[PDB]
Amino acid sequence: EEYIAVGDFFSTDPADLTFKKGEILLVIERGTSAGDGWWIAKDAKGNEGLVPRTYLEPYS
Amino acid sequence: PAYTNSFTRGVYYPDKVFRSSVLHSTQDLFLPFFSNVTWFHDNPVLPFNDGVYFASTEKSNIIRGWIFGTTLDSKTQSLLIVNNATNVVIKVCEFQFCNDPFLSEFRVYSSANNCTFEYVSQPFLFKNLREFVFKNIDGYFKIYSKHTPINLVRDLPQGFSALEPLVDLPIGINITRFQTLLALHAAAYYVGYLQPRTFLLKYNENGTITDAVDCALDPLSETKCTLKSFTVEKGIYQTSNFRVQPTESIVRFPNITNLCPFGEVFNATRFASVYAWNRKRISNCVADYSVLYNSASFSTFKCYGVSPTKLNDLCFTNVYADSFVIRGDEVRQIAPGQTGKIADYNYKLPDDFTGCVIAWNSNNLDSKVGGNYNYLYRLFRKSNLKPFERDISTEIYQAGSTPCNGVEGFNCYFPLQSYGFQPTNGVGYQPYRVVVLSFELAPATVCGPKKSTNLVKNKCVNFNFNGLTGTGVLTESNKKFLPFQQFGRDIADTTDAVRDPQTLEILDITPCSFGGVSVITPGTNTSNQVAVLYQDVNCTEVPNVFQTRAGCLIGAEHVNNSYE
Amino acid sequence: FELAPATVCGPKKSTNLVKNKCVNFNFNGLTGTGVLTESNKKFLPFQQFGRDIADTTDAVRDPQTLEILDITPCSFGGVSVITPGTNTSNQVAVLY
Amino acid sequence: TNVVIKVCEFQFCNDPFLSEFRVYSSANNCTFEYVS
Amino acid sequence: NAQALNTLVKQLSSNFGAISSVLNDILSRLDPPEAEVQIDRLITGRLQSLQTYVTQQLIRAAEIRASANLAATKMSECVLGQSKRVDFCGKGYHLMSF
Amino acid sequence: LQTYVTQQLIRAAEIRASANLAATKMSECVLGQSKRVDFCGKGYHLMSF
Ligand SMILES: *[C@@H]1O[C@H](CO)[C@@H](O)[C@H](O)[C@H]1NC(C)=O
Ligand SMILES: *[C@@H]1O[C@H](CO)[C@@H](O)[C@H](O)[C@H]1NC(C)=O
Ligand SMILES: *[C@@H]1O[C@H](CO)[C@@H](O)[C@H](O)[C@H]1NC(C)=O
Ligand SMILES: *[C@@H]1O[C@H](CO)[C@@H](O)[C@H](O)[C@H]1NC(C)=O
Ligand SMILES: *[C@@H]1O[C@H](CO)[C@@H](O)[C@H](O)[C@H]1NC(C)=O
Ligand SMILES: *[C@@H]1O[C@H](CO)[C@@H](O)[C@H](O)[C@H]1NC(C)=O
Ligand SMILES: *[C@@H]1O[C@H](CO)[C@@H](O)[C@H](O)[C@H]1NC(C)=O
Ligand SMILES: *[C@@H]1O[C@H](CO)[C@@H](O)[C@H](O)[C@H]1NC(C)=O
Ligand SMILES: *[C@@H]1O[C@H](CO)[C@@H](O)[C@H](O)[C@H]1NC(C)=O
Ligand SMILES: *[C@@H]1O[C@H](CO)[C@@H](O)[C@H](O)[C@H]1NC(C)=O
Ligand SMILES: *[C@@H]1O[C@H](CO)[C@@H](O)[C@H](O)[C@H]1NC(C)=O
Ligand SMILES: *[C@@H]1O[C@H](CO)[C@@H](O)[C@H](O)[C@H]1NC(C)=O
């Protein structure tokens, strides 16, 4: 299930990733137990980090 | 090291076309005349730099080939060329580098594993003087050669020699450096370089390039290219133009950063709770976001829909700020599209929130012994809160069907509960001071302070004043401006006077020097010396110099005596 | 097959030539229309075609024969009609 | 002594005038404020 | 002459169908792959303006040359000597001209 | 329109040259006698109307 980012989000936190519009990411397991409303997705370089739940939308 | 002067060599046929008794100008890679050429007599690696000119000395056969490529190692494939006087081997295999490769022969062979492209051809050819030009453009490697028996082996002989193409090879990979090959059983050779320089070529009846000139070497040769002739007659000729480029690119702006305090909303002693978050209007004030980045105190400085770098150059109005107290564990609840307990009943962020959230710990001030029971929150609500809404109400929850008449019971569940922030609480339960800034797009948005680069005078300097920009020399002005003008236009919508508001001192603006350069010559056959003329330019920045009413000219001496 | 420059393909058509006729020609890379005839100029062994002025090709050495030929655009221009007057007479003479 | 700019929600008056500040009908829900 | 140069300057401010009349704005806020489209309609307009000025300039140059030749002719006859031809230099019988 | 104006100017220029020539013939060959030969009619010119 590929997901497309509708906008650009900035992260200060060392736990988190940087994404822009049109970036391709791979969805990971839904074991959201570290924090509520937090999702993890892979980036082009493969680094993993927490990202906002609303920052991504379901592709179709 | 041991530079040598290439008098006229370094020319080759730009194409396989035929021209007879006609002068044609071609723009291609070339070696400028009288250009320094590195001389080795010793075999170190040399860079390619988009074309290499090679010339071996006579009475020698030590040189046997060249190796081209990017790294000449196991990482990237590299081109190998070796000539053994009977055949040429062209490998694009994976070859390692060598400390001192040489040839007894075939010693340069380090590794031939993983051969990508393979090619084999036949050899090309007081003694002959070998000259070769190598270039790689459009993925094609071209080889040029010409053997001319001459004398004066110590230096490059004068004269002319047109290099012809022999072989085209479709290598197609980037080449940045190469290395010559010597046979050990010291030779002298010269290495040049090429750049996109324009030459003029002369073709005889048989279509052989007998002579050529450079279009940027000297003013005399400058006129030849534009005149398409070698013998320019006695006269004055305009050959090109000139100008002066900007140097500093200064920018001036208004006396600034005086306005918009944020300590009253960031460093205020008292902040409201989450159930009574305030929304104060912030507009028409100059906010400096740079100081926030280097605060070294925030913990959840996250920006949604915007980046910290791009919110300074461009900004939006509607800077409503929300301040409230949130415990450390539930800080993440405050985000667009994020639901929960606090995000659902106290403060909900709408989707597509073009703003940032700033939070920092407040253990040393937002806590007291015995528990800080001063901050309250909404624990229960009948319906979810609409984003950006404050619900100040004393209505109590309705868990069951039996209504509550103000008396608390088993199903009333008074929503308002007070937080507990003891000094010994855990990091997750620590009350982190958090503020929220919202940006949306009323005209006349207000952004942060500008560059304010220091100015300069009497120099062609680019300027970008407030709204208006241009390039020109800045100087003092005797003109007077009324107190409600920022710049002035002489005529035909041409700005000629801008007052720097910071200094409040009107300054004239004029385009800096330019015009057409001309060459004065007495005739090609009559003499060789030429004089350069500049038109309508103060003779202080153009480069015997004589200043005249039509600008100054270089190469002539003023004479009081008057002649025809 | 996948796509290093200078790809190499199938053998070229190489059709026969014709002289002294306005004929389209398509050599190895260049093509045009003109009359082909013998030439007196001599090409060096490394040229393919030749031009004289304003990038006008006039001599092409066919690779198949290794011979040099002159190329000229075939006859064209404006045709004019000579008449003595409609009322004076009717016959007219064509002028090329 | 000063000029006050209210873009607030102000009701109409039959005969507004100024004793001063009589024209103040309603200042609720102020949107933009400016003083010079 | 003054207006012919003057009228050329305003042509720089002409949009010629482009969103901006200045080169800097076009090079700033346009995607370079499609930026040349606005430039092309601007170069043609500016080139057309320059073409008219030169062509119009040449027309006056021919007129001036005709005037200069006439002035030279009057110099040849009515200055360097006496003009026998009638009503060529001043009404009445001509003696000389200074 | 550009061509029409440009063509008009060329015709206007040569007409002006013709007008100046016509004015010249008026000054010499009408208002007086043109001693210059073959300027107004073949032969020894006397006068013109
Ligand atoms: C060429 O090299 C010589 C000696 O290194 C030096 O004096 C001269 O200025 C150089 N000229 C150029 C054009 O590099
Ligand atoms: C040769 O190098 C290419 C580089 O792309 C690599 O894909 C290939 O696996 C290599 N094969 C061998 C046998 O080294
Ligand atoms: C050569 O350099 C260009 C410049 O970016 C690059 O796009 C290309 O992939 C390079 N090719 C090789 C073979 O190094
Ligand atoms: C041209 O070549 C012919 C013979 O190949 C020779 O006789 C003649 O001198 C040459 N002319 C020039 C200008 O090179
Ligand atoms: C708040 O105080 C801290 C600590 O002195 C300081 O670093 C920061 O710049 C202040 N911010 C404001 C808006 O006053
Ligand atoms: C503003 O004006 C004062 C008055 O002299 C001056 O000292 C200061 O440098 C000015 N600031 C700027 C940014 O020009
Ligand atoms: C240069 O050529 C001109 C033109 O033929 C001639 O008048 C003049 O005498 C020549 N001067 C010399 C030094 O050959
Ligand atoms: C050229 O500029 C200098 C100052 O750099 C000035 O003294 C001189 O008068 C100027 N010359 C002219 C002709 O204006
Ligand atoms: C020429 O005139 C200048 C200016 O008056 C004067 O300084 C100079 O001595 C004169 N003689 C020469 C040879 O320049
Ligand atoms: C092609 O080369 C061969 C080589 O023997 C020759 O016999 C043949 O005549 C050549 N073709 C033409 C058209 O001349
Ligand atoms: C034809 O018409 C012309 C012009 O009117 C006239 O001069 C000529 O005599 C005519 N010829 C005949 C045969 O009618
Ligand atoms: C104030 O007016 C705005 C206009 O959009 C409205 O949305 C808001 O609910 C109003 N608030 C109050 C308290 O009247």
Numbering used by the authors:
A (entry chain D): 1 to 60
B (entry chain A): 26 to 66, 80 to 141, 155 to 176, 186 to 245, 262 to 517, 520 to 621, 641 to 661
C (entry chain C): 515 to 517, 520 to 612
D (entry chain B): 124 to 141, 155 to 172
E (entry chain B): 955 to 1052
F (entry chain C): 1004 to 1052
Paper text:
Here we describe TriSb92, a highly manufacturable and stable trimeric antibody-mimetic sherpabody targeted against a conserved region of the viral spike glycoprotein. To enhance targeting of the trimeric cell surface spike protein we constructed a multimerized derivative of Sb92 (TriSb92) containing three tandem copies of Sb92 connected by flexible 15-mer Gly-Ser linkers.
Reconstruction A describes the S-trimer with all three RBDs in the up-conformation decorated with additional density corresponding to bound TriSb92, while reconstruction B describes the S-trimer with all three RBDs in the down-conformation without any additional density indicative of a sherpabody. The placement of RBD and Sb92 models was unambiguous at map resolution of 6.9 Å, and identified the RT-loop of Sb92 as a key mediator of Sb-RBD interactions. TriSb92 targets a region distal from the ACE2 binding site that is highly conserved among sarbecoviruses. Indeed, the ability of ACE2 and Sb92 to simultaneously bind to the RBD in a non-competitive manner could also be experimentally verified using a sandwich-ELISA approach. Furthermore, apart from just three of the 27 RBD amino acids changes subsequently acquired by SARS-CoV-2 (S375F, T376A and R408S, which are located at the very edge of the TriSb92 epitope), VOCs, including the most recent Omicron subvariants, do not contain mutations involving this binding surface. Interestingly, the binding site of TriSb92 is inaccessible in the down-conformation of the RBD. This model is consistent with our findings that following TriSb92 treatment, the S-trimer presents primarily in an all-up state (~54%) fully engaged with the sherpabody, with smaller populations of mixed up/down and all-down states. However, the all three RBDs up state observed in our cryoEM analysis, performed using a prefusion-stabilized (K986P/V987P mutations) spike ectodomain with an abrogated furin cleavage site and a C-terminal trimerization domain, appears to reflect only the initial stage of this inhibitory conformational change, which in the case of native spike trimer on the viral membrane results in a more fundamental structural reorganization.
